[PDB]
Amino acid sequence: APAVADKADNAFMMICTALVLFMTIPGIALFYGGLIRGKNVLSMLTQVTVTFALVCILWVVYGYSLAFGEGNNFFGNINWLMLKNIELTAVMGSIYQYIHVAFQGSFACITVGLIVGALAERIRFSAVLIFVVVWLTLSYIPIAHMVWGGGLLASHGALDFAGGTVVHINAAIAGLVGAYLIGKPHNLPMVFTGTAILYIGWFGFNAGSAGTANEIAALAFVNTVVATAAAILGWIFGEWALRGKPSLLGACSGAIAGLVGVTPACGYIGVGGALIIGVVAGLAGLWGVTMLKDDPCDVFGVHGVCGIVGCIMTGIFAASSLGGVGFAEGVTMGHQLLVQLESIAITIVWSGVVAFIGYKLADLTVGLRVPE
Amino acid sequence: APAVADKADNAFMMICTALVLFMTIPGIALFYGGLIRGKNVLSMLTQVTVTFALVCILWVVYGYSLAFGEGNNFFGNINWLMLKNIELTAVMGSIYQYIHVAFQGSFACITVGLIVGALAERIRFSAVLIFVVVWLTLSYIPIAHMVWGGGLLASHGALDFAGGTVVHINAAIAGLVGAYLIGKPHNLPMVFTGTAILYIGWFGFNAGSAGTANEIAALAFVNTVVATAAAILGWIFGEWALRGKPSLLGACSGAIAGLVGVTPACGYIGVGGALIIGVVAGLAGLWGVTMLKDDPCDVFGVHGVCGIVGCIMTGIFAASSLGGVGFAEGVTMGHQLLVQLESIAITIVWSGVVAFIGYKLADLTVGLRVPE
Amino acid sequence: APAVADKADNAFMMICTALVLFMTIPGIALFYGGLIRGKNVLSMLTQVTVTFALVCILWVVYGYSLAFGEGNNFFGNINWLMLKNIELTAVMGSIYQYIHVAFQGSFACITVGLIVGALAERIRFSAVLIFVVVWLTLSYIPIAHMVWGGGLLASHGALDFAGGTVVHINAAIAGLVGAYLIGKPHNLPMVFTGTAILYIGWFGFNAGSAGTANEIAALAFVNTVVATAAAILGWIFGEWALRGKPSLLGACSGAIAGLVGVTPACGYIGVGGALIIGVVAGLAGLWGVTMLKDDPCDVFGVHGVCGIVGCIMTGIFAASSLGGVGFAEGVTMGHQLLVQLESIAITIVWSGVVAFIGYKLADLTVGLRVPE
Ligand SMILES: CCCCCCCCCCCC[N+](C)(C)[O-]
Ligand SMILES: CCCCCCCCCCCC[N+](C)(C)[O-]
Ligand SMILES: CCCCCCCCCCCC[N+](C)(C)[O-]
Ligand SMILES: [N]
Ligand SMILES: [N]
Ligand SMILES: [N]
Ligand SMILES: [N]
Ligand SMILES: [N]
Ligand SMILES: [N]
Ligand SMILES: [Xe]
Ligand SMILES: [Xe]
Ligand SMILES: [Xe]
Ligand SMILES: [Xe]
Ligand SMILES: [Xe]
Ligand SMILES: [Xe]
Ligand SMILES: [Xe]
Ligand SMILES: [Xe]
Ligand SMILES: [Xe]
Ligand SMILES: [Xe]
Ligand SMILES: [Xe]
Ligand SMILES: [Xe]
Ligand SMILES: [Xe]
Ligand SMILES: [Xe]
Ligand SMILES: [Xe]
Ligand SMILES: [Xe]
Ligand SMILES: [Xe]
Ligand SMILES: [Xe]
Ligand SMILES: [Xe]
Ligand SMILES: [Xe]
Ligand SMILES: [Xe]
Ligand SMILES: [Xe]
């Protein structure tokens, strides 16, 4: 009767967790390190590393319990503080629950890395730590519960395979609020290296979200290859048409645009949908950083816009008629789309409000703007 | 009756695919980035990234179908365009076929990365895209079909575990033709970093070519460690004897020489053969870049020479008497050697001719030499 | 009757081996590369690469046989020279023995990389090769046999999951002897990149030491996340208190301190113990590099001190009452602690003496100090 762990899924999921951690340490740190002024690199890398450590600790102390424990529509409980009452041999799905703790913790880490990396230039160090505590505890954790922890958005059938809302939109909005409150790249080879590490790690991010080494993991893997490639080509074509030539930063940005766009969709769509989502995301990203430029190192320009596009287009290309795996029983495309839009709107407002509270608390305690 | 996927092999093979993609993004890009003039790095990285995206797309659209579909001795068919008629739960060997699509696509990517990285300095950007289409479609795909897709060379019993011909010789010849038509490293730490990433990813390349996490994967893994180490020592000893001291570029080149040499052999030989092939490859590589120097960043000097040496020596050390896994029934060492040589010759001529056609078509459409 | 390999464990363990190799190539090379004077980087990278190749070869020729073959309390035998008499399908635990050869060889590689990287600046190149042969054969191999090969320390019940003694203390002492005999960082972004690669690879190091993708691997994985995070925070808090501000080098050093401290403990302790060991290790590391500064690039300052702290605290937090997996039957905490201390003392003296012999033999043959 009691579920038994499959060692193939244990192995797959521990390695996928390592790939996701790789996305933060050193992926996103190198990505931002090549974008910001050289004089701010060391401080940014320190803030990414220290806030990464903080997230790891908060996650085990109470974050996992409040995100994935049973509670209400908005948060879980505190019955798994420091993972108490989780037996070592406890199974979640087809893997040991300890591996689920680590895999889901690694997602919290990259989400925070996306914010801290972009704002470390301008925000005070003690203030970023305050902000991380506030926003992780009151925005990442409730939103993760609502989408992946059986809460409000899951109970309405929201489709988000690997975190278009939980990770990308959530962090993009936090970044924009930060930039609004706190008013050329020097090492593009480093930007490219970070981009590449983010790409390789993202296979653990997307495919690992199946929770098992099955055909859905395989689907998500292939769709991640295709969407990324198509968004690179889409971005680069739009750059050739708009600016006359492609650029390395454009190609890297296109890759990220496709990775973000396919994040919510990868486990639900066909390879034809992945190609279309990739092209659209690459072009919407290019448009986002162009026209929509309140954007610290273009957090929203890509993660926000492409996150929204992917979440919406997931409600389309999940349809069996378009090569997807099919909507749930009794769910039309029109209904699913409405659920995707509602989920996007809730994530935007929830993250913005918590982020405003986080930055304001930091500002009233220690001051936000980096000192003298 | 119908084959069932083993989740352990699914997991193994998806992670091996990620390791192979890692070899291109950022492996080979960093390798060449430290070798070429600083003023050409950004353009090379853009060309590697964009042509990588192009290969990914062409592979799914028609490349997989024409390489691994059933057809004739030279190419497959177009029954799997955009992977149509491949059910998601379809099994190939002991893994889902979708994972086979991705794994084999990643090999096409690194093969093209080897060419583009070396020639991006001198070739026009639109011309490289034309060349990639022509050469991928008419050289990589038919040669992959002939060797790994049940075509001409497979039907004669050619031994090539992970692509001495399909990947290394194929691309080396394309590189030389390019250099013939289009007539010191500045960041050796970057060269070393690329080399190291190529090394780690190559375990997915070599061991993943078993298609399963079995004793042949384990054999290929160990032989990859041994051959690489022995070629480093071989190259470095020859450099000490010839130039008076080892160098970092020598040590990295030796590593690549051993990785290339053991590619066709790793799943067929004993560890004693891997040591011998490594030493020979390291020394043949050193000789190749010395005496044979028409060599853009030494594509053939190592990949061509060591590819040929490895393919030949596979026909020797696969013998059971030498610790190998044994030739097929009824096959003597003399016969096997002849088959290896025939396979090498066909790959050289096929790739050269297609490459000449590719570069000439680009030259007549847009012009090959990078503009003003 | 005969053991059968589990493909899930085969896959897990081959990938963990690749992650451990990643720690040396390029992990530890980049770590030291950013620490030492720019003018010595290329020579250090060459020495790390060439000695890495040497270790790989010695391991297969005789090192595996003498470390993990059956012999006496101090070394094995020479019945597995070049892995002869090891059938390809031979099983060790739940994986093919060939994979065990590679996994354990990768540990020898990182241990030597820790020494060579730190001393390459000052030691002659031919002398480091002599030293590596002597110390690998007479210190790493016997100590690995004593702890993990059924020898003296294993037979007394010493707890060392992933090599607090075999790897970290062993190499730290060899480093100090070297520095005693042979009397600011320029690229901190490179130090951070090396640190990050060491971190990701260390999951293969720690979790792979379970030999299987089971709940102990999962435990070791989570404890590695927690201990690393806590040591970062511990180090950084002590730096804030002592120096007034955190630094990037501090944050990276704290990470390494926690990784070292949890190495012997990760598979035996609860997550609460991992947090405590991480904090203590981070602070002991900070103290080590402060007060105890005979320290070439701070080998002992972190690997030695934190290795000792972790080995001792493993004898505490393995207790079931503290969340650990429990001491063996009939073993009190007091007895276990005494065994940990005895194991630490034997490793320190054994490594020091062999290291002195190694450096002296090199000095009498070729001379230790780098020439003119
Ligand atoms: C593919 C046909 C789908 C149409 C389903 C009609 C019923 C639901 C309509 C809800 C409104 C549509 N939408 C996209 C604005 O939310
Ligand atoms: C180890 C004995 C192998 C000798 C087999 C003799 C029959 C085949 C001979 C074919 C010619 C040899 N070769 C290498 C030039 O192709
Ligand atoms: C948690 C209670 C453990 C006490 C066990 C008493 C018997 C063994 C005492 C050996 C001496 C202790 N120590 C730590 C100095 O080795
Ligand atoms: N990300
Ligand atoms: N990003
Ligand atoms: N390669
Ligand atoms: N290469
Ligand atoms: N290490
Ligand atoms: N380290
Ligand atoms: Xe795996
Ligand atoms: Xe964790
Ligand atoms: Xe985590
Ligand atoms: Xe990229
Ligand atoms: Xe993956
Ligand atoms: Xe990419
Ligand atoms: Xe969503
Ligand atoms: Xe990796
Ligand atoms: Xe693909
Ligand atoms: Xe691929
Ligand atoms: Xe290397
Ligand atoms: Xe691998
Ligand atoms: Xe290497
Ligand atoms: Xe071949
Ligand atoms: Xe990996
Ligand atoms: Xe090995
Ligand atoms: Xe190894
Ligand atoms: Xe890297
Ligand atoms: Xe780090
Ligand atoms: Xe792992
Ligand atoms: Xe870290
Ligand atoms: Xe120990």
mmCIF file of N, CA and C in Angstrom, chain B residues 184-274:
data_model
loop_
_atom_site.group_PDB
_atom_site.id
_atom_site.type_symbol
_atom_site.label_atom_id
_atom_site.label_comp_id
_atom_site.label_asym_id
_atom_site.label_seq_id
_atom_site.Cartn_x
_atom_site.Cartn_y
_atom_site.Cartn_z
ATOM 1 N N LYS B 184 49.302 33.978 -31.164
ATOM 2 C CA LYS B 184 49.284 33.143 -29.963
ATOM 3 C C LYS B 184 48.010 33.389 -29.153
ATOM 4 N N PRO B 185 47.488 32.342 -28.509
ATOM 5 C CA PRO B 185 46.244 32.494 -27.742
ATOM 6 C C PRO B 185 46.331 33.613 -26.714
ATOM 7 N N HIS B 186 45.221 34.337 -26.554
ATOM 8 C CA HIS B 186 45.182 35.504 -25.683
ATOM 9 C C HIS B 186 44.585 35.216 -24.310
ATOM 10 N N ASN B 187 43.856 34.090 -24.141
ATOM 11 C CA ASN B 187 43.231 33.768 -22.863
ATOM 12 C C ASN B 187 43.289 32.241 -22.686
ATOM 13 N N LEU B 188 44.464 31.760 -22.289
ATOM 14 C CA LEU B 188 44.715 30.345 -22.086
ATOM 15 C C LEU B 188 43.920 29.825 -20.894
ATOM 16 N N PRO B 189 43.714 30.619 -19.838
ATOM 17 C CA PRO B 189 42.778 30.166 -18.798
ATOM 18 C C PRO B 189 41.400 29.866 -19.359
ATOM 19 N N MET B 190 40.949 30.639 -20.346
ATOM 20 C CA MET B 190 39.665 30.349 -20.985
ATOM 21 C C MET B 190 39.751 29.089 -21.840
ATOM 22 N N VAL B 191 40.860 28.904 -22.559
ATOM 23 C CA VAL B 191 41.049 27.662 -23.298
ATOM 24 C C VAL B 191 40.974 26.468 -22.358
ATOM 25 N N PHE B 192 41.629 26.568 -21.204
ATOM 26 C CA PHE B 192 41.621 25.460 -20.253
ATOM 27 C C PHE B 192 40.214 25.190 -19.737
ATOM 28 N N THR B 193 39.453 26.252 -19.480
ATOM 29 C CA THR B 193 38.094 26.088 -18.985
ATOM 30 C C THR B 193 37.226 25.400 -20.025
ATOM 31 N N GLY B 194 37.339 25.820 -21.284
ATOM 32 C CA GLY B 194 36.607 25.145 -22.341
ATOM 33 C C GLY B 194 37.008 23.687 -22.453
ATOM 34 N N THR B 195 38.322 23.422 -22.429
ATOM 35 C CA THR B 195 38.820 22.046 -22.486
ATOM 36 C C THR B 195 38.221 21.198 -21.375
ATOM 37 N N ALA B 196 38.196 21.741 -20.151
ATOM 38 C CA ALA B 196 37.658 21.006 -19.013
ATOM 39 C C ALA B 196 36.174 20.703 -19.194
ATOM 40 N N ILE B 197 35.408 21.670 -19.697
ATOM 41 C CA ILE B 197 33.987 21.440 -19.928
ATOM 42 C C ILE B 197 33.797 20.403 -21.021
ATOM 43 N N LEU B 198 34.613 20.467 -22.062
ATOM 44 C CA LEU B 198 34.529 19.440 -23.093
ATOM 45 C C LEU B 198 34.809 18.065 -22.494
ATOM 46 N N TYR B 199 35.755 17.991 -21.552
ATOM 47 C CA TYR B 199 36.117 16.717 -20.929
ATOM 48 C C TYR B 199 34.963 16.145 -20.116
ATOM 49 N N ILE B 200 34.379 16.958 -19.229
ATOM 50 C CA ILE B 200 33.274 16.477 -18.404
ATOM 51 C C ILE B 200 32.081 16.089 -19.279
ATOM 52 N N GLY B 201 31.746 16.921 -20.256
ATOM 53 C CA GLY B 201 30.626 16.598 -21.127
ATOM 54 C C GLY B 201 30.858 15.344 -21.952
ATOM 55 N N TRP B 202 32.114 15.055 -22.277
ATOM 56 C CA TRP B 202 32.458 13.905 -23.102
ATOM 57 C C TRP B 202 32.123 12.577 -22.431
ATOM 58 N N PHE B 203 31.986 12.550 -21.105
ATOM 59 C CA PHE B 203 31.526 11.316 -20.459
ATOM 60 C C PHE B 203 30.084 11.015 -20.828
ATOM 61 N N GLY B 204 29.250 12.051 -20.921
ATOM 62 C CA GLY B 204 27.914 11.849 -21.457
ATOM 63 C C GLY B 204 27.961 11.443 -22.912
ATOM 64 N N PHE B 205 28.927 11.977 -23.643
ATOM 65 C CA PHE B 205 29.078 11.688 -25.067
ATOM 66 C C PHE B 205 29.470 10.236 -25.278
ATOM 67 N N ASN B 206 30.510 9.795 -24.584
ATOM 68 C CA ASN B 206 31.010 8.445 -24.765
ATOM 69 C C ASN B 206 30.137 7.420 -24.054
ATOM 70 N N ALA B 207 29.917 7.594 -22.752
ATOM 71 C CA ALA B 207 29.153 6.584 -22.026
ATOM 72 C C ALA B 207 27.699 6.552 -22.485
ATOM 73 N N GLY B 208 27.109 7.716 -22.760
ATOM 74 C CA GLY B 208 25.730 7.732 -23.231
ATOM 75 C C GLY B 208 25.542 6.999 -24.540
ATOM 76 N N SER B 209 26.618 6.810 -25.305
ATOM 77 C CA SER B 209 26.481 6.110 -26.579
ATOM 78 C C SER B 209 26.166 4.629 -26.394
ATOM 79 N N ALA B 210 26.254 4.103 -25.170
ATOM 80 C CA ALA B 210 25.765 2.755 -24.905
ATOM 81 C C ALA B 210 24.241 2.685 -24.931
ATOM 82 N N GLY B 211 23.561 3.817 -24.779
ATOM 83 C CA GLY B 211 22.117 3.835 -24.778
ATOM 84 C C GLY B 211 21.486 3.310 -23.514
ATOM 85 N N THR B 212 22.288 2.982 -22.498
ATOM 86 C CA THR B 212 21.802 2.364 -21.266
ATOM 87 C C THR B 212 22.918 2.423 -20.237
ATOM 88 N N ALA B 213 22.536 2.444 -18.958
ATOM 89 C CA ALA B 213 23.508 2.491 -17.861
ATOM 90 C C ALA B 213 23.940 1.066 -17.490
ATOM 91 N N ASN B 214 24.663 0.428 -18.417
ATOM 92 C CA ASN B 214 25.064 -0.966 -18.228
ATOM 93 C C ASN B 214 26.581 -1.076 -18.130
ATOM 94 N N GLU B 215 27.122 -2.287 -18.296
ATOM 95 C CA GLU B 215 28.561 -2.484 -18.181
ATOM 96 C C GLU B 215 29.327 -1.888 -19.358
ATOM 97 N N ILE B 216 28.671 -1.700 -20.502
ATOM 98 C CA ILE B 216 29.355 -1.079 -21.631
ATOM 99 C C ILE B 216 29.489 0.426 -21.403
ATOM 100 N N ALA B 217 28.455 1.045 -20.843
ATOM 101 C CA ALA B 217 28.572 2.437 -20.424
ATOM 102 C C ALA B 217 29.713 2.596 -19.426
ATOM 103 N N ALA B 218 29.809 1.678 -18.463
ATOM 104 C CA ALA B 218 30.879 1.723 -17.466
ATOM 105 C C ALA B 218 32.248 1.566 -18.116
ATOM 106 N N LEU B 219 32.375 0.592 -19.018
ATOM 107 C CA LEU B 219 33.598 0.425 -19.794
ATOM 108 C C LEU B 219 33.959 1.701 -20.530
ATOM 109 N N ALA B 220 32.997 2.268 -21.252
ATOM 110 C CA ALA B 220 33.295 3.479 -22.007
ATOM 111 C C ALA B 220 33.715 4.605 -21.071
ATOM 112 N N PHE B 221 33.097 4.677 -19.891
ATOM 113 C CA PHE B 221 33.459 5.706 -18.926
ATOM 114 C C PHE B 221 34.904 5.544 -18.489
ATOM 115 N N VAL B 222 35.280 4.337 -18.074
ATOM 116 C CA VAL B 222 36.650 4.136 -17.616
ATOM 117 C C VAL B 222 37.628 4.371 -18.757
ATOM 118 N N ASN B 223 37.335 3.841 -19.947
ATOM 119 C CA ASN B 223 38.274 4.029 -21.048
ATOM 120 C C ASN B 223 38.450 5.501 -21.383
ATOM 121 N N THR B 224 37.405 6.302 -21.191
ATOM 122 C CA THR B 224 37.523 7.729 -21.444
ATOM 123 C C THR B 224 38.462 8.381 -20.439
ATOM 124 N N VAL B 225 38.388 7.984 -19.169
ATOM 125 C CA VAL B 225 39.330 8.508 -18.186
ATOM 126 C C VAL B 225 40.752 8.149 -18.580
ATOM 127 N N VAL B 226 40.984 6.864 -18.869
ATOM 128 C CA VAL B 226 42.336 6.369 -19.125
ATOM 129 C C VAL B 226 42.917 6.959 -20.411
ATOM 130 N N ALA B 227 42.166 6.916 -21.512
ATOM 131 C CA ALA B 227 42.722 7.411 -22.771
ATOM 132 C C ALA B 227 43.072 8.892 -22.680
ATOM 133 N N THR B 228 42.217 9.682 -22.023
ATOM 134 C CA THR B 228 42.480 11.110 -21.901
ATOM 135 C C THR B 228 43.758 11.341 -21.116
ATOM 136 N N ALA B 229 43.883 10.650 -19.986
ATOM 137 C CA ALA B 229 45.058 10.811 -19.152
ATOM 138 C C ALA B 229 46.313 10.418 -19.903
ATOM 139 N N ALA B 230 46.255 9.312 -20.654
ATOM 140 C CA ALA B 230 47.441 8.831 -21.350
ATOM 141 C C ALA B 230 47.835 9.747 -22.501
ATOM 142 N N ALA B 231 46.863 10.379 -23.154
ATOM 143 C CA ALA B 231 47.186 11.275 -24.250
ATOM 144 C C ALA B 231 47.757 12.581 -23.725
ATOM 145 N N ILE B 232 47.297 13.026 -22.552
ATOM 146 C CA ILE B 232 47.918 14.178 -21.910
ATOM 147 C C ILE B 232 49.385 13.893 -21.656
ATOM 148 N N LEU B 233 49.673 12.734 -21.054
ATOM 149 C CA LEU B 233 51.052 12.382 -20.746
ATOM 150 C C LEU B 233 51.860 12.172 -22.019
ATOM 151 N N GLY B 234 51.265 11.537 -23.031
ATOM 152 C CA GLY B 234 51.970 11.364 -24.297
ATOM 153 C C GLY B 234 52.314 12.684 -24.964
ATOM 154 N N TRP B 235 51.327 13.572 -25.081
ATOM 155 C CA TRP B 235 51.570 14.871 -25.698
ATOM 156 C C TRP B 235 52.642 15.629 -24.926
ATOM 157 N N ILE B 236 52.527 15.628 -23.599
ATOM 158 C CA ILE B 236 53.413 16.422 -22.759
ATOM 159 C C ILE B 236 54.824 15.856 -22.786
ATOM 160 N N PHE B 237 54.956 14.526 -22.830
ATOM 161 C CA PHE B 237 56.291 13.967 -22.993
ATOM 162 C C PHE B 237 56.896 14.375 -24.331
ATOM 163 N N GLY B 238 56.102 14.361 -25.405
ATOM 164 C CA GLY B 238 56.656 14.731 -26.699
ATOM 165 C C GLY B 238 57.001 16.203 -26.775
ATOM 166 N N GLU B 239 56.225 17.037 -26.087
ATOM 167 C CA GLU B 239 56.519 18.462 -25.999
ATOM 168 C C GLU B 239 57.769 18.705 -25.168
ATOM 169 N N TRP B 240 57.926 17.975 -24.065
ATOM 170 C CA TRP B 240 59.144 18.115 -23.278
ATOM 171 C C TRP B 240 60.358 17.742 -24.112
ATOM 172 N N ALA B 241 60.237 16.680 -24.908
ATOM 173 C CA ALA B 241 61.367 16.204 -25.691
ATOM 174 C C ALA B 241 61.655 17.115 -26.877
ATOM 175 N N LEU B 242 60.611 17.640 -27.509
ATOM 176 C CA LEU B 242 60.744 18.439 -28.723
ATOM 177 C C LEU B 242 61.011 19.915 -28.431
ATOM 178 N N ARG B 243 60.319 20.490 -27.438
ATOM 179 C CA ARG B 243 60.406 21.911 -27.123
ATOM 180 C C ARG B 243 61.095 22.195 -25.795
ATOM 181 N N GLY B 244 61.424 21.176 -25.014
ATOM 182 C CA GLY B 244 62.155 21.387 -23.785
ATOM 183 C C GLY B 244 61.306 21.571 -22.546
ATOM 184 N N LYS B 245 60.003 21.808 -22.694
ATOM 185 C CA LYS B 245 59.132 22.026 -21.546
ATOM 186 C C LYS B 245 57.693 21.767 -21.964
ATOM 187 N N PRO B 246 56.839 21.347 -21.046
ATOM 188 C CA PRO B 246 55.409 21.280 -21.347
ATOM 189 C C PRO B 246 54.797 22.672 -21.328
ATOM 190 N N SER B 247 53.606 22.772 -21.914
ATOM 191 C CA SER B 247 52.836 24.007 -21.937
ATOM 192 C C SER B 247 51.379 23.685 -21.622
ATOM 193 N N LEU B 248 50.636 24.708 -21.199
ATOM 194 C CA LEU B 248 49.227 24.499 -20.889
ATOM 195 C C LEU B 248 48.446 24.131 -22.142
ATOM 196 N N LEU B 249 48.697 24.837 -23.242
ATOM 197 C CA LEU B 249 48.011 24.512 -24.486
ATOM 198 C C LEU B 249 48.325 23.087 -24.921
ATOM 199 N N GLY B 250 49.571 22.649 -24.730
ATOM 200 C CA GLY B 250 49.901 21.260 -25.007
ATOM 201 C C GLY B 250 49.084 20.299 -24.167
ATOM 202 N N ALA B 251 49.010 20.555 -22.863
ATOM 203 C CA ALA B 251 48.263 19.640 -22.009
ATOM 204 C C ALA B 251 46.787 19.586 -22.410
ATOM 205 N N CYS B 252 46.183 20.736 -22.706
ATOM 206 C CA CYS B 252 44.789 20.729 -23.142
ATOM 207 C C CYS B 252 44.631 20.009 -24.469
ATOM 208 N N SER B 253 45.566 20.239 -25.396
ATOM 209 C CA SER B 253 45.486 19.598 -26.699
ATOM 210 C C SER B 253 45.627 18.095 -26.564
ATOM 211 N N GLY B 254 46.527 17.649 -25.685
ATOM 212 C CA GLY B 254 46.655 16.223 -25.448
ATOM 213 C C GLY B 254 45.366 15.621 -24.932
ATOM 214 N N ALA B 255 44.712 16.310 -23.998
ATOM 215 C CA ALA B 255 43.433 15.824 -23.500
ATOM 216 C C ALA B 255 42.464 15.631 -24.653
ATOM 217 N N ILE B 256 42.341 16.646 -25.516
ATOM 218 C CA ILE B 256 41.410 16.541 -26.631
ATOM 219 C C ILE B 256 41.824 15.405 -27.550
ATOM 220 N N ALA B 257 43.130 15.253 -27.780
ATOM 221 C CA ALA B 257 43.602 14.173 -28.644
ATOM 222 C C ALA B 257 43.163 12.810 -28.122
ATOM 223 N N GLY B 258 43.264 12.593 -26.809
ATOM 224 C CA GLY B 258 42.863 11.312 -26.250
ATOM 225 C C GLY B 258 41.361 11.113 -26.274
ATOM 226 N N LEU B 259 40.610 12.187 -26.041
ATOM 227 C CA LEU B 259 39.159 12.106 -26.108
ATOM 228 C C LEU B 259 38.692 11.756 -27.514
ATOM 229 N N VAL B 260 39.306 12.370 -28.523
ATOM 230 C CA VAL B 260 38.967 12.074 -29.907
ATOM 231 C C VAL B 260 39.361 10.645 -30.253
ATOM 232 N N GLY B 261 40.583 10.248 -29.899
ATOM 233 C CA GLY B 261 41.051 8.922 -30.265
ATOM 234 C C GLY B 261 40.204 7.808 -29.676
ATOM 235 N N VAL B 262 39.722 7.996 -28.446
ATOM 236 C CA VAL B 262 38.961 6.941 -27.788
ATOM 237 C C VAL B 262 37.481 6.985 -28.142
ATOM 238 N N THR B 263 37.009 8.067 -28.758
ATOM 239 C CA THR B 263 35.602 8.171 -29.144
ATOM 240 C C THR B 263 35.101 6.958 -29.919
ATOM 241 N N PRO B 264 35.740 6.519 -31.004
ATOM 242 C CA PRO B 264 35.213 5.354 -31.727
ATOM 243 C C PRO B 264 35.414 4.060 -30.986
ATOM 244 N N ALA B 265 36.349 4.031 -30.047
ATOM 245 C CA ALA B 265 36.805 2.791 -29.456
ATOM 246 C C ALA B 265 36.228 2.502 -28.078
ATOM 247 N N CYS B 266 35.687 3.504 -27.378
ATOM 248 C CA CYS B 266 35.590 3.405 -25.922
ATOM 249 C C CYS B 266 34.729 2.229 -25.479
ATOM 250 N N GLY B 267 33.673 1.938 -26.214
ATOM 251 C CA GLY B 267 32.799 0.853 -25.852
ATOM 252 C C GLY B 267 33.213 -0.502 -26.343
ATOM 253 N N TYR B 268 34.363 -0.610 -27.018
ATOM 254 C CA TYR B 268 34.776 -1.865 -27.635
ATOM 255 C C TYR B 268 36.098 -2.415 -27.128
ATOM 256 N N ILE B 269 36.891 -1.630 -26.405
ATOM 257 C CA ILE B 269 38.257 -1.988 -26.087
ATOM 258 C C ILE B 269 38.400 -2.243 -24.588
ATOM 259 N N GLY B 270 39.527 -2.882 -24.226
ATOM 260 C CA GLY B 270 39.930 -2.995 -22.846
ATOM 261 C C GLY B 270 40.688 -1.773 -22.367
ATOM 262 N N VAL B 271 40.888 -1.715 -21.050
ATOM 263 C CA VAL B 271 41.535 -0.544 -20.470
ATOM 264 C C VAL B 271 42.993 -0.473 -20.903
ATOM 265 N N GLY B 272 43.610 -1.619 -21.188
ATOM 266 C CA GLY B 272 44.957 -1.603 -21.745
ATOM 267 C C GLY B 272 44.999 -0.993 -23.133
ATOM 268 N N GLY B 273 44.001 -1.306 -23.959
ATOM 269 C CA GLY B 273 43.902 -0.667 -25.263
ATOM 270 C C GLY B 273 43.639 0.827 -25.168
ATOM 271 N N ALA B 274 42.846 1.240 -24.179
ATOM 272 C CA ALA B 274 42.577 2.658 -24.004
ATOM 273 C C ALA B 274 43.852 3.407 -23.657
#
